[PDB]
């Protein structure tokens, strides 16, 4: 019935490097990929993180993964952007990581709304659409 992939209805590829997507609390995960070198992904990251702050930890968890190779670039950027450090993660291998290939990030930085069963229910959600989805 299910298949691993990056399309809605697929099982999101597991992130090893980490608290699971699956849970028994009905909690959803906003998985977001960005990098300081991609201006657009960086601005979407700030807007999404501030939207998630409108909801409780029980409803949604944000998992933002930076694909910048340098840890100092990730640290400085997250500090400048004033984002909740509990939701900001760093994949040090960047383009060379298995994650980058698994989420087809060569096609561009993307986000995924994953349900409590680890299934992608939405892709490239806007802050506005994320709120409309979480309130229904």
Binding site for Cl ion (CB under 5 A): 14-15, 20-21
Give the end-to-end CA distance of the chain in Å, rounded to a whole number.
25
Q: Residue 77 or residue 112: which is nearer to Cl ion going by CB?
A: 112
Q: How far is the CB of 18 from Cl ion (least distance, A)?
A: 6
Distance, in Å, from the CA atom of 69 to the CA atom of 73, rounded to the nearest integer, reads: 8
Q: How far is the CB of 119 from Cl ion (least distance, A)?
A: 12
Q: Are the C-beta atoms of 89 and 19 separated by less than 8 Å?
A: no
Q: Residue 20 or residue 53: which is nearer to Cl ion going by CB?
A: 20
Q: How far is the CB of 114 from Cl ion (least distance, A)?
A: 8
Residue nearest to Cl ion (CB): 14
- Backbone breaks in the chain after residues (C–N over 2.5 Å): 17
Distance, in Å, from the CA atom of 91 to the CA atom of 64, rounded to the nearest integer, reads: 10
Q: Residue 21 or residue 77: which is nearer to Cl ion going by CB?
A: 21
């Amino acid at each position: 019935k299910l298949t691993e992939g990056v399309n809605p209805g697929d099982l999101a590829p597991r992130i090893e490097f980490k608290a699971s997507f699956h849970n028994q609390l009905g909690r959803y995960t906003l998985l977001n990929f960005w990098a300081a070198y991609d201006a657009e992904s960086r601005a979407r990251n700030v807007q999404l993180a501030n939207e998630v702050n409108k909801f409780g930890p029980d409803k949604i968890a944000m998992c933002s993964i930076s694909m910048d190779e340098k840890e100092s670039i990730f640290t400085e950027t997250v500090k400048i952007d004033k984002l909740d450090l509990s939701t900001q993660f760093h994949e040090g291998l960047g383009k060379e990581s298995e994650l980058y290939k698994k989420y087809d990030l060569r096609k561009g930085f993307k986000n995924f709304l994953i349900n409590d069963e680890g299934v992608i229910i939405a892709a490239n959600v806007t802050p506005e659409k994320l709120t409309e989805i979480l309130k229904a």
